[PDB]
mmCIF file of C-alpha atoms and ligand atoms in Angstrom:
data_model
loop_
_atom_site.group_PDB
_atom_site.id
_atom_site.type_symbol
_atom_site.label_atom_id
_atom_site.label_comp_id
_atom_site.label_asym_id
_atom_site.label_seq_id
_atom_site.Cartn_x
_atom_site.Cartn_y
_atom_site.Cartn_z
ATOM 1 C CA UNK P 1 -8.802 6.407 -3.072
ATOM 2 C CA UNK P 2 -11.156 7.869 -5.630
ATOM 3 C CA UNK P 3 -14.643 6.376 -5.820
ATOM 4 C CA UNK P 4 -14.257 4.598 -2.480
ATOM 5 C CA UNK P 5 -16.588 4.091 0.487
ATOM 6 C CA UNK P 6 -15.665 4.459 4.139
ATOM 7 C CA UNK P 7 -14.281 1.181 5.416
ATOM 8 C CA UNK P 8 -15.736 -0.349 8.559
ATOM 9 C CA UNK P 9 -13.356 0.264 11.519
ATOM 10 C CA UNK P 10 -12.262 -3.391 11.828
ATOM 11 C CA UNK P 11 -12.330 -4.560 8.218
ATOM 12 C CA UNK P 12 -8.628 -4.092 7.367
ATOM 13 C CA UNK P 13 -6.568 -4.371 10.569
ATOM 14 C CA UNK P 14 -3.222 -4.727 8.811
ATOM 15 C CA UNK P 15 -3.552 -1.296 7.133
ATOM 16 C CA UNK P 16 -1.171 1.260 8.655
ATOM 17 C CA UNK P 17 -0.721 5.013 8.135
ATOM 18 C CA UNK P 18 2.936 6.030 7.476
ATOM 19 C CA UNK P 19 3.452 9.605 8.583
ATOM 20 C CA UNK P 20 6.250 12.145 8.699
ATOM 21 C CA UNK P 21 7.027 14.793 11.258
ATOM 22 C CA UNK P 22 5.917 18.224 10.075
ATOM 23 C CA UNK P 23 6.650 20.999 12.590
ATOM 24 C CA UNK P 24 4.700 20.347 15.782
ATOM 25 C CA UNK P 25 2.669 17.618 14.130
ATOM 26 C CA UNK P 26 2.599 14.557 11.932
ATOM 27 C CA UNK P 27 1.331 14.229 8.377
ATOM 28 C CA UNK P 28 0.054 11.108 6.635
ATOM 29 C CA UNK P 29 2.072 10.403 3.514
ATOM 30 C CA UNK P 30 1.502 6.734 2.630
ATOM 31 C CA UNK P 31 -0.112 3.465 3.631
ATOM 32 C CA UNK P 32 1.632 0.248 4.571
ATOM 33 C CA UNK P 33 0.798 -3.248 5.739
ATOM 34 C CA UNK P 34 1.709 -4.593 9.153
ATOM 35 C CA UNK P 35 3.422 -7.941 8.428
ATOM 36 C CA UNK P 36 5.178 -8.686 11.758
ATOM 37 C CA UNK P 37 4.476 -7.060 15.167
ATOM 38 C CA UNK P 38 7.594 -4.970 14.460
ATOM 39 C CA UNK P 39 7.686 -4.901 10.665
ATOM 40 C CA UNK P 40 5.734 -2.923 8.051
ATOM 41 C CA UNK P 41 5.702 -3.451 4.310
ATOM 42 C CA UNK P 42 5.321 -0.289 2.230
ATOM 43 C CA UNK P 43 6.487 1.223 -1.051
ATOM 44 C CA UNK P 44 10.132 2.196 -1.484
ATOM 45 C CA UNK P 45 9.042 5.514 -3.071
ATOM 46 C CA UNK P 46 7.281 6.440 0.198
ATOM 47 C CA UNK P 47 10.582 6.487 2.079
ATOM 48 C CA UNK P 48 12.743 8.173 -0.526
ATOM 49 C CA UNK P 49 12.748 11.469 1.379
ATOM 50 C CA UNK P 50 15.111 11.832 4.370
ATOM 51 C CA UNK P 51 12.175 12.478 6.746
ATOM 52 C CA UNK P 52 11.324 11.334 10.244
ATOM 53 C CA UNK P 53 8.665 8.638 9.987
ATOM 54 C CA UNK P 54 6.204 7.023 12.328
ATOM 55 C CA UNK P 55 3.700 4.255 11.804
ATOM 56 C CA UNK P 56 0.165 4.394 13.154
ATOM 57 C CA UNK P 57 -1.631 1.061 13.597
ATOM 58 C CA UNK P 58 -5.322 0.794 14.566
ATOM 59 C CA UNK P 59 -5.971 4.076 12.759
ATOM 60 C CA UNK P 60 -9.341 4.939 11.214
ATOM 61 C CA UNK P 61 -9.873 8.686 11.211
ATOM 62 C CA UNK P 62 -6.668 10.701 10.711
ATOM 63 C CA UNK P 63 -8.089 13.901 12.209
ATOM 64 C CA UNK P 64 -9.689 12.464 15.380
ATOM 65 C CA UNK P 65 -8.794 10.235 18.327
ATOM 66 C CA UNK P 66 -10.435 6.858 17.660
ATOM 67 C CA UNK P 67 -9.149 5.482 20.953
ATOM 68 C CA UNK P 68 -7.664 2.481 19.119
ATOM 69 C CA UNK P 69 -4.362 3.812 17.723
ATOM 70 C CA UNK P 70 -0.807 2.807 18.626
ATOM 71 C CA UNK P 71 1.998 5.147 17.504
ATOM 72 C CA UNK P 72 5.467 3.777 16.820
ATOM 73 C CA UNK P 73 8.712 5.159 15.455
ATOM 74 C CA UNK P 74 10.502 3.622 12.463
ATOM 75 C CA UNK P 75 13.832 2.292 13.670
ATOM 76 C CA UNK P 76 15.187 0.917 10.427
ATOM 77 C CA UNK P 77 14.330 1.291 6.753
ATOM 78 C CA UNK P 78 15.263 -1.422 4.259
ATOM 79 C CA UNK P 79 14.464 -0.501 0.668
ATOM 80 C CA UNK P 80 14.758 -3.143 -2.071
ATOM 81 C CA UNK P 81 18.353 -2.801 -3.301
ATOM 82 C CA UNK P 82 17.276 -2.600 -6.972
ATOM 83 C CA UNK P 83 14.839 0.278 -6.379
ATOM 84 C CA UNK P 84 15.595 3.392 -8.414
ATOM 85 C CA UNK P 85 13.753 6.640 -7.629
ATOM 86 C CA UNK P 86 14.169 7.858 -11.233
ATOM 87 C CA UNK P 87 12.370 4.753 -12.591
ATOM 88 C CA UNK P 88 9.196 3.616 -10.729
ATOM 89 C CA UNK P 89 8.309 1.666 -13.892
ATOM 90 C CA UNK P 90 11.374 -0.591 -13.397
ATOM 91 C CA UNK P 91 9.635 -2.002 -10.327
ATOM 92 C CA UNK P 92 11.166 -2.993 -6.999
ATOM 93 C CA UNK P 93 8.905 -0.414 -5.284
ATOM 94 C CA UNK P 94 8.949 -2.087 -1.919
ATOM 95 C CA UNK P 95 10.495 -1.417 1.466
ATOM 96 C CA UNK P 96 10.389 -2.924 4.922
ATOM 97 C CA UNK P 97 10.262 -0.786 8.029
ATOM 98 C CA UNK P 98 11.439 -2.181 11.384
ATOM 99 C CA UNK P 99 9.366 -0.576 14.146
ATOM 100 C CA UNK P 100 11.103 0.741 17.265
ATOM 101 C CA UNK P 101 8.669 -1.262 19.403
ATOM 102 C CA UNK P 102 6.500 -4.312 18.670
ATOM 103 C CA UNK P 103 2.832 -3.329 18.401
ATOM 104 C CA UNK P 104 0.062 -5.093 20.317
ATOM 105 C CA UNK P 105 -2.399 -7.095 18.252
ATOM 106 C CA UNK P 106 -6.151 -6.803 18.712
ATOM 107 C CA UNK P 107 -9.299 -6.424 16.565
ATOM 108 C CA UNK P 108 -7.961 -3.202 15.007
ATOM 109 C CA UNK P 109 -4.320 -4.330 14.678
ATOM 110 C CA UNK P 110 -3.465 -7.592 12.906
ATOM 111 C CA UNK P 111 -0.750 -8.938 10.593
ATOM 112 C CA UNK P 112 -1.510 -8.887 6.873
ATOM 113 C CA UNK P 113 -1.757 -12.274 5.225
ATOM 114 C CA UNK P 114 0.691 -12.556 2.320
ATOM 115 C CA UNK P 115 0.194 -14.726 -0.735
ATOM 116 C CA UNK P 116 2.301 -17.784 -1.393
ATOM 117 C CA UNK P 117 5.389 -16.983 -3.518
ATOM 118 C CA UNK P 118 4.760 -16.868 -7.300
ATOM 119 C CA UNK P 119 0.994 -16.570 -7.014
ATOM 120 C CA UNK P 120 -0.603 -14.773 -9.926
ATOM 121 C CA UNK P 121 -4.284 -13.858 -9.913
ATOM 122 C CA UNK P 122 -6.580 -14.646 -12.832
ATOM 123 C CA UNK P 123 -7.804 -11.616 -14.784
ATOM 124 C CA UNK P 124 -10.703 -9.871 -13.062
ATOM 125 C CA UNK P 125 -9.970 -11.275 -9.566
ATOM 126 C CA UNK P 126 -11.788 -9.521 -6.728
ATOM 127 C CA UNK P 127 -9.643 -7.092 -4.745
ATOM 128 C CA UNK P 128 -10.093 -3.971 -2.631
ATOM 129 C CA UNK P 129 -7.636 -1.118 -2.349
ATOM 130 C CA UNK P 130 -7.629 0.680 1.028
ATOM 131 C CA UNK P 131 -6.143 3.988 2.110
ATOM 132 C CA UNK P 132 -6.389 7.602 3.142
ATOM 133 C CA UNK P 133 -5.104 8.895 -0.219
ATOM 134 C CA UNK P 134 -6.733 11.645 -2.275
ATOM 135 C CA UNK P 135 -10.438 11.157 -2.899
ATOM 136 C CA UNK P 136 -10.168 12.955 -6.215
ATOM 137 C CA UNK P 137 -7.417 13.676 -8.766
ATOM 138 C CA UNK P 138 -5.740 16.832 -7.385
ATOM 139 C CA UNK P 139 -7.987 16.520 -4.325
ATOM 140 C CA UNK P 140 -7.379 16.064 -0.647
ATOM 141 C CA UNK P 141 -6.631 13.072 1.580
ATOM 142 C CA UNK P 142 -9.528 11.260 3.183
ATOM 143 C CA UNK P 143 -10.214 11.704 6.873
ATOM 144 C CA UNK P 144 -11.524 8.160 7.306
ATOM 145 C CA UNK P 145 -9.999 5.028 5.752
ATOM 146 C CA UNK P 146 -11.541 4.365 2.317
ATOM 147 C CA UNK P 147 -11.922 1.180 0.297
ATOM 148 C CA UNK P 148 -12.696 0.557 -3.364
ATOM 149 C CA UNK P 149 -13.371 -2.630 -5.300
ATOM 150 C CA UNK P 150 -10.675 -2.890 -7.980
ATOM 151 C CA UNK P 151 -10.709 -6.144 -9.990
ATOM 152 C CA UNK P 152 -7.306 -7.197 -11.284
ATOM 153 C CA UNK P 153 -6.281 -6.611 -14.896
ATOM 154 C CA UNK P 154 -3.848 -9.377 -15.834
ATOM 155 C CA UNK P 155 -0.382 -8.740 -17.259
ATOM 156 C CA UNK P 156 -1.316 -9.437 -20.907
ATOM 157 C CA UNK P 157 -4.123 -6.849 -20.835
ATOM 158 C CA UNK P 158 -2.323 -4.438 -18.527
ATOM 159 C CA UNK P 159 0.879 -4.372 -20.563
ATOM 160 C CA UNK P 160 -1.030 -3.949 -23.852
ATOM 161 C CA UNK P 161 -0.734 -0.704 -25.804
ATOM 162 C CA UNK P 162 -4.175 0.731 -24.805
ATOM 163 C CA UNK P 163 -3.346 0.168 -21.120
ATOM 164 C CA UNK P 164 0.098 0.700 -19.622
ATOM 165 C CA UNK P 165 2.214 -0.827 -22.373
ATOM 166 C CA UNK P 166 5.843 -1.626 -21.440
ATOM 167 C CA UNK P 167 5.576 0.510 -18.283
ATOM 168 C CA UNK P 168 3.919 -2.412 -16.480
ATOM 169 C CA UNK P 169 6.134 -5.353 -15.578
ATOM 170 C CA UNK P 170 5.273 -8.898 -14.525
ATOM 171 C CA UNK P 171 6.544 -8.016 -11.021
ATOM 172 C CA UNK P 172 3.462 -5.790 -10.660
ATOM 173 C CA UNK P 173 -0.298 -6.288 -10.280
ATOM 174 C CA UNK P 174 -2.735 -3.984 -12.048
ATOM 175 C CA UNK P 175 -6.212 -3.426 -10.639
ATOM 176 C CA UNK P 176 -9.184 -1.296 -11.647
ATOM 177 C CA UNK P 177 -8.945 1.156 -14.555
ATOM 178 C CA UNK P 178 -12.727 1.761 -14.797
ATOM 179 C CA UNK P 179 -12.276 5.567 -14.842
ATOM 180 C CA UNK P 180 -14.222 6.004 -11.591
ATOM 181 C CA UNK P 181 -12.394 4.018 -8.900
ATOM 182 C CA UNK P 182 -8.680 3.977 -8.185
ATOM 183 C CA UNK P 183 -5.778 4.545 -5.834
ATOM 184 C CA UNK P 184 -4.555 8.153 -5.642
ATOM 185 C CA UNK P 185 -1.703 10.108 -4.016
ATOM 186 C CA UNK P 186 -1.285 9.073 -0.374
ATOM 187 C CA UNK P 187 -2.511 5.508 -0.956
ATOM 188 C CA UNK P 188 0.965 4.435 -2.103
ATOM 189 C CA UNK P 189 2.615 1.807 0.054
ATOM 190 C CA UNK P 190 -0.755 0.448 1.220
ATOM 191 C CA UNK P 191 -2.314 -2.912 0.528
ATOM 192 C CA UNK P 192 -4.291 -4.371 -2.306
ATOM 193 C CA UNK P 193 -6.383 -7.062 -0.566
ATOM 194 C CA UNK P 194 -7.586 -9.864 -2.845
ATOM 195 C CA UNK P 195 -9.996 -12.669 -1.917
ATOM 196 C CA UNK P 196 -8.378 -16.074 -2.558
ATOM 197 C CA UNK P 197 -9.684 -19.387 -1.188
ATOM 198 C CA UNK P 198 -11.999 -17.484 1.169
ATOM 199 C CA UNK P 199 -9.274 -15.367 2.791
ATOM 200 C CA UNK P 200 -8.248 -11.827 1.880
ATOM 201 C CA UNK P 201 -4.503 -11.678 1.248
ATOM 202 C CA UNK P 202 -2.294 -8.671 0.510
ATOM 203 C CA UNK P 203 -1.309 -9.214 -3.104
ATOM 204 C CA UNK P 204 -0.128 -5.699 -3.878
ATOM 205 C CA UNK P 205 1.727 -2.708 -2.523
ATOM 206 C CA UNK P 206 0.227 0.442 -4.108
ATOM 207 C CA UNK P 207 2.878 1.949 -6.391
ATOM 208 C CA UNK P 208 1.633 4.300 -9.106
ATOM 209 C CA UNK P 209 -1.170 5.793 -11.149
ATOM 210 C CA UNK P 210 -1.144 7.697 -14.421
ATOM 211 C CA UNK P 211 0.420 11.161 -14.639
ATOM 212 C CA UNK P 212 -2.922 12.068 -16.291
ATOM 213 C CA UNK P 213 -4.775 11.478 -13.034
ATOM 214 C CA UNK P 214 -5.871 8.821 -10.560
ATOM 215 C CA UNK P 215 -9.083 7.383 -12.027
ATOM 216 C CA UNK P 216 -8.200 7.170 -15.720
ATOM 217 C CA UNK P 217 -9.939 4.668 -17.968
ATOM 218 C CA UNK P 218 -7.475 1.967 -19.006
ATOM 219 C CA UNK P 219 -4.826 3.198 -16.607
ATOM 220 C CA UNK P 220 -5.519 0.858 -13.691
ATOM 221 C CA UNK P 221 -3.739 1.492 -10.412
ATOM 222 C CA UNK P 222 -0.395 -0.352 -10.387
ATOM 223 C CA UNK P 223 0.946 -2.252 -7.414
ATOM 224 C CA UNK P 224 4.140 -4.087 -6.554
ATOM 225 C CA UNK P 225 3.320 -7.837 -6.777
ATOM 226 C CA UNK P 226 3.895 -9.004 -3.199
ATOM 227 C CA UNK P 227 4.129 -12.644 -4.320
ATOM 228 C CA UNK P 228 7.246 -11.828 -6.365
ATOM 229 C CA UNK P 229 9.076 -10.665 -3.206
ATOM 230 C CA UNK P 230 8.319 -13.308 -0.581
ATOM 231 C CA UNK P 231 11.907 -14.570 -0.246
ATOM 232 C CA UNK P 232 13.265 -11.004 -0.277
ATOM 233 C CA UNK P 233 10.839 -10.150 2.555
ATOM 234 C CA UNK P 234 11.790 -13.273 4.547
ATOM 235 C CA UNK P 235 15.514 -12.631 3.930
ATOM 236 C CA UNK P 236 15.234 -9.101 5.268
ATOM 237 C CA UNK P 237 13.213 -10.075 8.331
ATOM 238 C CA UNK P 238 15.583 -12.923 9.172
ATOM 239 C CA UNK P 239 18.768 -10.832 8.752
ATOM 240 C CA UNK P 240 17.502 -7.815 10.752
HETATM 241 C C1 TPX J 301 0.940 6.708 -4.543
HETATM 242 O O1 TPX J 301 0.361 7.309 -3.657
HETATM 243 C C2 TPX J 301 0.879 6.946 -6.039
HETATM 244 C C3 TPX J 301 -0.556 6.957 -6.466
HETATM 245 C C4 TPX J 301 -1.233 5.663 -6.044
HETATM 246 C C5 TPX J 301 1.624 8.174 -6.359
HETATM 247 C C6 TPX J 301 2.985 8.304 -5.793
HETATM 248 N N1 TPX J 301 3.136 8.129 -4.368
HETATM 249 S S1 TPX J 301 2.991 9.486 -3.441
HETATM 250 O O2 TPX J 301 1.895 10.258 -3.869
HETATM 251 O O3 TPX J 301 3.115 9.091 -2.089
HETATM 252 C C7 TPX J 301 4.519 10.304 -3.819
HETATM 253 C C8 TPX J 301 4.924 10.961 -4.787
HETATM 254 C C9 TPX J 301 6.091 11.695 -4.838
HETATM 255 C C10 TPX J 301 6.774 11.994 -3.676
HETATM 256 C C11 TPX J 301 8.044 12.793 -3.733
HETATM 257 C C12 TPX J 301 6.285 11.556 -2.459
HETATM 258 C C13 TPX J 301 5.117 10.822 -2.407
HETATM 259 C C14 TPX J 301 1.650 8.469 -7.832
HETATM 260 O O4 TPX J 301 1.579 9.680 -8.166
HETATM 261 O O5 TPX J 301 1.758 7.516 -8.626
HETATM 262 CA CA1 CA J 302 -7.453 8.568 14.651
#
């Protein structure tokens, strides 16, 4: 996240780090949201490569032991069946990961609250993106989890010609676009937390930013709209 601030250690306990095995170690590649003790919601584009993945819950600093982390392998990957790698703009950028073991909940590890199905936020709704993605366009990943306030940009504005045009669909949420704050590579898959009726809920799954760069004026970060996929999510969880 570009233009973010370090999150407090226990602010976003559903945020997970999705990592892939790289030689003798592990490398962060995307975020995700813990939605069941053994299920993670992330972006389908994060699991397009045939890599070995693990999820880290209760993570704060990627390069140091925080003494709060739980490490778990990904046992099954279910990508939305309409997802197409060649077309992120078509949408369906969502996937569910069944964890090899159920994680233990505590103040650093909690399930993400999902919105009711069909919920659409009013323009300019208050949301925060969180993640360890690049802190600058063509930069490096953050060491500590970052957060940035990114107000939503409704579909009418977001899909307008000055913004994203036809690239944005109504199955997505746009947020930000101020030219200073945004998601960036490595934040994909993570949550967009929006305050609704006093409770933060995960309304988006980070999906894409402009090819021009991360923090680009009028190119708000684009997220899969979680509330469009509630029955899909429940169907997967129930049949697996
Ligand atoms: C997500 O991080 C997104 C910006 C918010 C990225 C794409 N996701 S990624 O950087 O994880 C990705 C890109 C390509 C591959 C092969 C793997 C990972 C974006 O550039 O829109
Ligand atoms: Ca750590």
